[PDB]
Amino acid sequence: AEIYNKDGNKLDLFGKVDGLHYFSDDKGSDGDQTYMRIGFKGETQVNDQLTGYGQWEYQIQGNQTEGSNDSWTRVAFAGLKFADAGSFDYGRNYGVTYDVTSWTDVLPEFGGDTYGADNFMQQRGNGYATYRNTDFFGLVDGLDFALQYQGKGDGYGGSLTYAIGEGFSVGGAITTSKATVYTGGLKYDANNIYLAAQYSQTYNATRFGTSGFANKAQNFEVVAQYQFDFGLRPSVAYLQSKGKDISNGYGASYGDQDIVKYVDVGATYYFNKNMSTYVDYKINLLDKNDFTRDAGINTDDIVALGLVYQF
């Protein structure tokens, strides 16, 4: 719902209320995961040349019992667009990495996940000062590039997107907080088809489950998806992350073990643009073992069912 438009100032005010339930043995899965989002995009125009924006999107849980809060700013930032010289926007905002990682982040419930938000760049973060440049100066059509800075520690980022005309797209991003991480992705967006795959390499994953970081991490994800016309986007997808020599902060070592790996059958049923329902079944592969045990890492297969209502 875009709620204000007068004198070159547009303000949209989105929200969703997803009521959903997990089913799995792992007792910190099975249960209600209902939550809602309240966000707001914004726009102010001055001039022909430049347009000023500003955005904010919050996630508040509705699974938590009364007297209790669960919530975080998903993003908050404010920027400036200059016509043909792209944009600058400072504040809590998706890492440049996510530019290419996002292509695989499209499953009905689970996905992305190999990185976290505040996983030292790969999804969101704080203090982020991005510059985006779209259509390379009005010069090379279809080629967009972004160069980022993260706050604290320090980090630099770069991402290069290219849809080789058509629906084929190639994806490349490098991110190096101070601990570099790489990323390549491919996506095919055509005749109600969606094929996307991406993977990446890193120095340290740090902030991971509850057990420190490796010295090398190897994450890969891929999904195929069709868009039926009565509304129904059955998605099957696979992703996995592998480790290296990993510390319990102090000592511990845990070594060479899988971090996450699963196949995913999923169906998202779009009623209309504003209401969806979805069913999602995570086919988990990981074996309940010391690494997973101590670090709380989910070893059980789960299946989630949810009724999303947006705006």
The region of 69-77, 82-90, 152-160, 194-202 touching Cl ion under the rule CB under 5 A is 69-77
Q: Taking CB under 5 A as the rule, does residue 284 contact Ca ion?
A: yes
Q: Which two tokens stand for residue 101?
A: 């990682």
**Residue 275 touches which of a copy of itself, Ca ion, Cl ion, none (CB < 5 to 8 A by kind)?**
a copy of itself
Positive or negative, the CA dihedral 107, 97, 18, 32 is: positive
- Least distance from C-beta 127 to Ca ion, angstroms? 25
Total residue count of the chain as it appears in this document: 311
The Cα angle at residue 307 between residues 301 and 311, in degrees rounded to 5: 130
**Residue 289 touches which of a copy of itself, Ca ion, Cl ion, none (CB < 5 to 8 A by kind)?**
none
Q: Taking CB under 8 A as the rule, does residue 311 contact a copy of itself?
A: yes
Query: For Ca ion, which is the closer residue by CB, 155 or 171?
Result: 171
Residue 48, SS3? coil
Q: Taking CB under 8 A as the rule, does residue 261 contact a copy of itself?
A: no
Q: Taking CB under 8 A as the rule, does residue 216 contact a copy of itself?
A: no
**Residue 208 touches which of Ca ion, a copy of itself, Cl ion, none (CB < 5 to 8 A by kind)?**
Cl ion
CB 211 within 8 A of CB 254: yes
CB 110 within 8 A of CB 284: no
Q: Is 254 left (phi over 0), alpha (psi -120 to 50) or beta?
A: left
Q: Taking CB under 5 A as the rule, does residue 211 contact Ca ion?
A: no
**Residue 284 touches which of Cl ion, Ca ion, a copy of itself, none (CB < 5 to 8 A by kind)?**
Ca ion
**Residue 255 touches which of Cl ion, Ca ion, a copy of itself, none (CB < 5 to 8 A by kind)?**
none
Residue with tokens 């997990």: 22
Binding string, 21-40, against a copy of itself, x = CB under 8 A? x---------xx-xxx-x-x
In the window 20-59, what residues touch Cl ion (CB under 5 A)?
Answer: 59
Q: Is 167 left (phi over 0), alpha (psi -120 to 50) or beta?
A: alpha
Which DSSP state fits 65?
Answer: P
Q: Taking CB under 5 A as the rule, does residue 244 contact Cl ion?
A: no
# binding residues, a copy of itself (CB under 8 A): 71
Rounded CA-CA distance 211/124 in Å is 20
CB 77 within 8 A of CB 90: yes
- Contacts with Ca ion, residue ranges (CB under 5 A): 135, 284
Binding site for Cl ion (CB under 5 A): 59, 69, 74, 208
